[model samples]
Target chain A: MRILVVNVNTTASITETIAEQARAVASPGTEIVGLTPYFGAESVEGNFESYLAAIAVMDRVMAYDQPFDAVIQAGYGEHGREGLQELLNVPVVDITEAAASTAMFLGHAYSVVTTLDRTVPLIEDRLKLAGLYQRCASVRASGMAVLELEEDPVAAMEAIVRQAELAIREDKAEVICLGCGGMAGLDEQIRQRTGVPVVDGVTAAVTIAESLVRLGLSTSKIRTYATPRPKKVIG
Target chain B: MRILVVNVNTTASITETIAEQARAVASPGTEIVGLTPYFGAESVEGNFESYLAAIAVMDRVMAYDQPFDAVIQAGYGEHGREGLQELLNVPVVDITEAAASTAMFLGHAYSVVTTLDRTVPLIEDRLKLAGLYQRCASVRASGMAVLELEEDPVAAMEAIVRQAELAIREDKAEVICLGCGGMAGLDEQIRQRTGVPVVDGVTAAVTIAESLVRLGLSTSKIRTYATPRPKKVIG
Candidate 1:
């Protein structure tokens, strides 16, 4: 099975990082392809970047001339999965939804420790739209921008550790969902603060896409996610 | 099954209101006994008041001489169900949990429209403690004090209608769970704005207890809520 882990931004490093994690979790028979958009934000944070990335992602995937079994939209809470869902009959998975759903199986309620407070609403909105918000306890902001995630390695861990700890104590989240694609690597230092399960998006999203394919399922074309109609172009 | 709908306040009015709703939802053979705490806050609105109501509720139920099959702690987000679980082997259900869980069956996510902003944290905390916070989209404040719920009938409807609308649009809640026990009599105006289902506590709490008794299940005796060991519990 071939899976395209499409990055929602133009950055190659984050795309490869997301793909690396997905590859690590991929089964022996599966192939992972990391596709970075030809044009978009260096790092998606605000709604403008997110909205533009949505278009960029669809264009990037549309330009992928090869056939893939599934597509994993790998930008934590950014938009575009639904557009892809409308365009493809193959499985379309959003990293945020996969991580949140996986966390539900492990614990009562889950919290997403995301990059910034600005992006928290995006994550919450996505979860709400996808019907996964019901099991989400909270979406905690790590007080770091998406780009800052790579600047100070230790700061990322410390910021998220504090937010994750508070999420458990105050928000009562039993499992932690790492809300950024960049957070594929962390430590037991988080577990030391709270004996909780931490979930990463790339692993859950890829495996879930694989499982969906194994079960012979793909995007339903009946209703809300039906294919787009014939229309005129403004872009 | 004989179930006691215990009020966590000293107000007979609210107690009877809670009891009336419980009785309305009771099965033909089921008995709904409305028990009011002999001593507690007139209206529970804060943590200081809720904790006292916990002890008051347990003492009130302990003073009852009759045998009942279940108990519904009839405060919206107020405490005491766990304490009752500790004292009896019968089923103990909090109205908030029953309402929140029922909302999950009807919609993608549920928001609580409660009395005050001060009590929103209590509702959120209780939902978190009960492991029901994951599916809860938002605990919206109706901006009314607990006592004001009865002052102006028209104002209550408008306040909650506006809040419930935002819960649908901003919070993306598909169902509205009435976060106060006094909200049992509101109209279709809520559903008109959002075309979403609205959930009330008493009906859900009463029927759930009957369902539990029908299933012959109560609180599990293995952990957390097992019978309390005799120890020094100061008054």
Candidate 2:
């Protein structure tokens, strides 16, 4: 089966990181297709950037003419999930929802460690939307920029590990969820340092998307996820 | 995909109900094989019964020679879940884990409305093991027996709905997870009355199991869930 992993931002490095993580956990026969949109912000830091990235995300999703078994929205809060599901016939799996759900499997309370403080609220909003806010012990920011995480992997790891310690001690978190798609390959290290299960959204989304495809399941096109009605578009 | 849904008890009627619920949410291509062990407690009400049911559950799982994409331990507390995963090559999902995880998908804090007060501690222990104790708002009993739920559906619904209301108001729960596998078909009605997302373990287990199978993901057998070394068994 083939799955499309879309990095909502215009960061090829982050896209590669996410795709690498996705491929690591994917089944033998499943193919991972990673896409980085060319027309979005360099990094999504808050609600505004997330919203801005949605257009480019949708464009990239629509532009993929080749058939994919499923699609994984590699960004947190599934920025363009609803729209993509409405537009495509395949199942759309969001990273935040997948990670949170997967975290629930391993622990009672989980905390998210992300890039910036501004993005914390965006993550919180997504948790509320997914009904996982209460289960989240906390959403901690590592005080790192999205691109900084890629440029200085050592600093990023140190910051994330420090925050994870705080989350475990202060929030009483039993599990840790890496909150940014750019934080894909660091879950194992974080888990080792914090001594808790660490979940990465990219891996979670890929597995869930693969499952949906294997089951031949698609978004319920009956109501909320129904196809958009034909309408005029003005630039 | 084909999934084996084990009731983990000796009640055929309960198995049918679970199977029905499993099929309801399953994709059209997915098939559910419902199994009721020939030897076990008639109903699993508390820890003792759950323990008694585990032997039979393990037996049934071992006896299934046909290929199944995944297996769903359809009883609460996921009796024998770890052992089954160790024994089988397929993904083994516990109903309790599935329901709790699914609950987190829709709400921040969820309360479990179960059958008996004696079973409350048992449910609580399971939540703690799964790291969902903090996320769980409460575990409330409906004051009904396992068979009572099947015999008097009306009374069972009334009791569950009443407890759900209390859970919402008193426990501050945003979602209600039906704690018993027997409470499968009543989630929709409970949701309508309680005005919150109601999750059933049977359906949750089936969908999750299907997802695991499609992705060709199973419990990691390299370390924790590795196959048991051959040893002598004494009766």
Q: Please compute the TM-score of chain B alone for each predicted structure, in the order given.
A: 0.96, 0.97
Q: What TM-score does candidate 2 reach?
A: 0.65
List candidate 1 stretches off by more than 4 Å.
A1-235, B187-189, B232-235
Model 2: per-residue Cα lDDT over A1-235, one tens digit each: 8999999889787788788888887877889999998687888767778888887898998888898888888897646777886788777778998987776544447889988898888888887766566668899999987677657889989999999999888887767888888787677687668666677888878766765554334554433455788899885
Give the best candidate by DockQ: 2
Q: Write the per-residue lDDT of candidate 2 for residues B1-235, one digit (tens) a residue.
A: 8889999779898899899878877866788899998787888876777877887888887888888788888987645777786787777788888877766534447889998998888888877766567668899999998889868999999999999999888887877889888888887798788876677878777767765554334554433456788999886
lDDT of 1 by residue, B1-235 (tens): 7999888889999889888877765667888999888888998889999999999999999999999999888888888777787688777878888777656534456789998899999999988876668768899998877787678877888899999988878887867888778787463466656566677777767765665564334553433455688899886
Model 1 TM-score, 2 decimals: 0.53
For residues A87-197, write the lDDT of model 1, one tens digit per residue.
Answer: 987878888877775555345567899988999998899887765677688999999887777899788888999898888778878778898888875523565555666
